[PDB]
Amino acid sequence: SVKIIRLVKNREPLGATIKKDEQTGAIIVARIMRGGAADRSGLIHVGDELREVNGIPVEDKRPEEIIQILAQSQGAITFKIIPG
Amino acid sequence: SVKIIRLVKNREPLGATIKKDEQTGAIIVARIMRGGAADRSGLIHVGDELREVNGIPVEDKRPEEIIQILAQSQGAITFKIIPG
Amino acid sequence: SVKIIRLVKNREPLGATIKKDEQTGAIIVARIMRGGAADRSGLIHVGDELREVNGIPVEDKRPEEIIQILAQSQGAITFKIIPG
Secondary structure, rough: OOEEOOOOOOOOOEEEEEEEOOOOOOEEEEEEEEOOHHHHHOOOOOEEEEEEEEEEOOOOOOHHHHHHHHHHOOOOEEEEEEEE | OOOOEEEEEOOOOEEEEEOOOOOOOEEEEEOOOOOHHHHHOOOOOOOOOOEEOOOOOOOOHHHHHHHHHHHOOOHHHHHHHOOO | EEEEEEEEEOOOOOOEEEEEEOOOOEEEEEOOOOOHHHHOOOOOOOOEEEEEOOOHHHHHHHHHHHHHHHHOOEEEEEEEEEEE
16 A cells, blocks of 8 residues: 655665666665664565555656665655565 | 766765666666755756766776765765766 | 775765776776765775675675665764775
8 A cells, every 4th residue: 555655865875775686677675774864763574565656656767766866865755665 | 979077965965876887887866855955956966977976987897896985985076977 | 916995975976986806806996976975984995895885794785775875864874895
């Protein structure tokens, strides 16, 4: 079931890495850095699937693009996710 | 026609994503984040082609390398671009 | 011979890029940004091979993953390296 979550990163990384599952095509949260922005929010966890970032769907994009959107965004950031 | 532009990013992302066009080989600005460093400069736009970053030519490099140069650089950053 | 080094990056990039050597499989430091965190430490140099980041071995991971770990980490960061 798809959930909307929102957190803030300012002058700090998101603190999360992603990996595309090559069999399912899912973009999955692979790692949460301890004490980073993602971790402190308590809203996003290893195994969660990313569906959208700031209203941008992933489903038609390559990982290299999605990883840049996570890195190049600033301030409040919305994710639509399927929780693990 | 190739243009030299210079902007500053300090303790913030560039606020721009790039994508290689697999047919032409061009590295093209794919997205400008609203309110980010790139946007605020007014110097770089979706559809612009990157030719050089800080005097480093792109033309013999893979996207994974160029994306890291954009992320790992700090302070004033020069681009040589072909405007869209 | 493998060396453990530790540096700090906070609200700034690492200031280093990496590239996998497709023949050897090594993850090699390709560039050190002048005045960046990596450069100022004096501990890491072009040609050094990364073996681990914060205790995470590289040897079973893709470059896209390792590059994210470098970018998404904050604060003190440990590397295990083979100096060039």
